[PDB]
């Protein structure tokens, strides 16, 4: 069919790979697979080693430092290739067998394995002013020829191709995302009831949000404005639990409701990248070199998973926030507001 080839700049170390884009399920991991073809006449005694380093880039997009490099890798697995692992008999795959049959016995294969508790390949938005290596988590597969792990990797004889790990939709969804929060003011003990609902929980990217609001304003106050906005929650977990609250698409409507009156009509929202070009700190799903992609697919995890170990976790929650008026015997136009959370997993389907 088709197999990707990268090859060394020198023209000696060539790495094959089945699928650049790799899926990940809740409790099952798609394994990477590939073979390495190199001229043994060149490799007199040097051993070819192939690794997978899940880089986390966080420092700007400028040049590196003498010793800092502002990087860390959450998982580095190295597997020997020369000789073809005589100690351990790896479970050779159908793809690996076909690849070794296409070429001769010169090539030697390799195989990795990814623990499920690892972040999906997401790169944060570089921004307009930045020009360089992007932020976020970026997978990598590199094969080098050397004699020891501690030895320097000769870049002039080093091959590197970027893979991406991306999660795909759950075919069976839950019932619905619903939440209803009321608020009682100090002036009167007649709180108003707010209800919000969505069409489904999993949304294919670009599909329209269908928020269904329902307010029963029983208090002696008026709702000035209604704000609906899907907010990207990019829970960066490096050694902390830092959280971001970048909005993606906010639609407003001055549909005021009189006191002691109800109001229920559905709104439509669509999250897209065309008008979010300048929003620095946004999370985007995957980048090979610079090709524009969609927004960050919601990285679902298995129920009860250790959610305090991963690299970057993004999730999408829509806010139904409406602003009220502080009119009365002694009050100004400025007042507070009541908002309700609603989570939904907007992320790709499976072909």
């Amino acid at each position, epitope marked *: 069919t*088709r197999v990707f080839k990268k090859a060394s700049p020198n023209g000696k170390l060539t790495v094959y790979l089945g699928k650049r884009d790799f899926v990940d399920h809740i409790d099952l991991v798609d394994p990477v697979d590939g073979v390495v073809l190199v001229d043994p006449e060149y490799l007199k005694e040097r051993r070819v080693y192939v690794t997978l380093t899940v880089a986390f880039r966080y420092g700007r997009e400028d040049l590196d430092v003498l010793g800092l490099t502002f990087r860390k890798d959450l998982f580095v697995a190295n597997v020997q290739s020369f000789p073809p692992a005589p100690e351990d008999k790896k479970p050779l795959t159908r793809l690996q067998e076909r690849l070794i049959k296409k070429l001769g016995e010169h090539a030697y294969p390799f195989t990795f394995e990814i623990p499920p508790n690892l972040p999906s390949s997401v790169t944060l938005q570089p921004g307009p002013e930045d020009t360089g290596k992007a932020l976020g988590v970026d997978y990598e597969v590199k094969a080098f020829v050397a004699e020891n792990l501690e030895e320097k990797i000769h870049k002039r004889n080093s091959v590197r191709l970027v893979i991406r790990k991306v999660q795909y939709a759950p075919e069976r969804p839950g019932p619905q995302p619903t939440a209803e929060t009321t608020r009682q003011f100090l002036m009167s003990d007649k709180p108003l009831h707010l209800e919000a609902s969505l069409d489904k929980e999993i949304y*294919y990217h*670009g599909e329209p949000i269908s928020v269904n609001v329902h307010v029963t304003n029983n208090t002696n106050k008026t709702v000035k404005k209604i704000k609906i906005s899907v907010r990207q929650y990019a829970d960066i977990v490096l050694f902390n639990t830092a959280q971001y609250k970048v909005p993606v698409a906010m639609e407003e409507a001055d549909d005021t409701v009189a006191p002691s009156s109800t109001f229920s009509k559905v709104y439509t929202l669509t999250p*897209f990248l*065309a*008008n979010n070009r300048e929003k620095r700190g946004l999370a985007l799903d995957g980048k090979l070199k610079h090709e524009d992609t969609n927004l960050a697919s919601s990285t679902l995890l298995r129920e009860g998973a250790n959610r305090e170990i991963l690299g970057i976790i993004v999730s999408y929650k829509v806010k139904v926030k409406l602003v009220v008026s502080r009119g009365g015997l002694l009050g100004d136009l400025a007042s507070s507001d009541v908002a309700v959370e609603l989570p939904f997993t907007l992320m790709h389907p499976k072909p």
Partner: single-chain antibody, 227 residues
């Protein structure tokens, strides 16, 4: 699930026309509405495309700086302004929809509007130019690409009058809705699909598309007749 086309007519040279196509059931933020031109008695050629999710606007060599294409998400409609029409712009325009994520050929098309005027670049090559065959004759049409695309090609069976439909994409999988007899294969830069059981309905002109680089363009064109 379908897209309509409107705005046809006859415009003198130097005129303008804001021909527009409207689609229902296709989210504009999930589908990149395309725009193609079939010359009178010649081959179809892509002219413009807008991918509303990204806010981009790609053109072609004869299209860049000539006409303007825009769309709005409110009416789910795309309006193509054919400003500064010339003699070479005389063609029929079909409004086509493709999945704006992971391009998979042109799924849905439109009726089309005929436009007439009165008072780097790569080119796929399709062979044979013409052919006449009967029922049960194994026929293969080869689309040879000058520059090797990454296994991402599509084939369209355009009957006379009606808009072309999609049968294959990436030369491997057939679109849901076509009979299983259709197939396809990749051989280097040469792309070939097989038509053996030539039914009376399947006898129509075939066209090869390569959706790899910008200025996406069709090939040369083939025809299927009865021997």
């Amino acid at each position: 699930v379908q897209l309509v086309e409107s705005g046809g007519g006859l415009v003198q040279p130097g005129g303008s026309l804001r021909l527009s196509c409207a689609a229902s059931g296709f989210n504009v933020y999930s589908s990149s509405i395309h725009w193609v031109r079939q010359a009178p008695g010649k081959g179809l050629e892509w002219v413009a495309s807008i991918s509303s999710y990204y806010g981009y606007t790609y053109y072609a060599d004869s299209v860049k700086g000539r006409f303007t294409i825009s769309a709005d998400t409110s009416k789910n409609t795309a309006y193509l302004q054919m400003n500064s029409l010339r003699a070479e712009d005389t063609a029929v325009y079909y409004c086509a929809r493709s999945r704006q994520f992971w391009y998979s050929g042109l799924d849905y098309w439109g009726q089309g509007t005929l436009v007439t005027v009165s008072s780097s670049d790569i080119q796929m090559t399709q062979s044979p130019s013409s052919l006449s065959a009967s029922v049960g004759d194994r026929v293969t049409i080869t689309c040879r690409a000058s520059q090797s695309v990454s296994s991402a090609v599509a084939w369209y069976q355009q009957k006379p009058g009606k808009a072309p439909k999609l049968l294959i994409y990436s030369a491997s999988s057939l679109y849901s809705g076509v009979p299983s007899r259709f197939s396809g294969s990749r051989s280097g830069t040469d792309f070939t699909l097989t038509i053996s059981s030539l039914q009376p309905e399947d006898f129509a002109t075939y066209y090869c598309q390569q959706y790899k680089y910008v200025p996406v363009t069709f090939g040369q064109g083939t025809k299927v007749e009865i021997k």
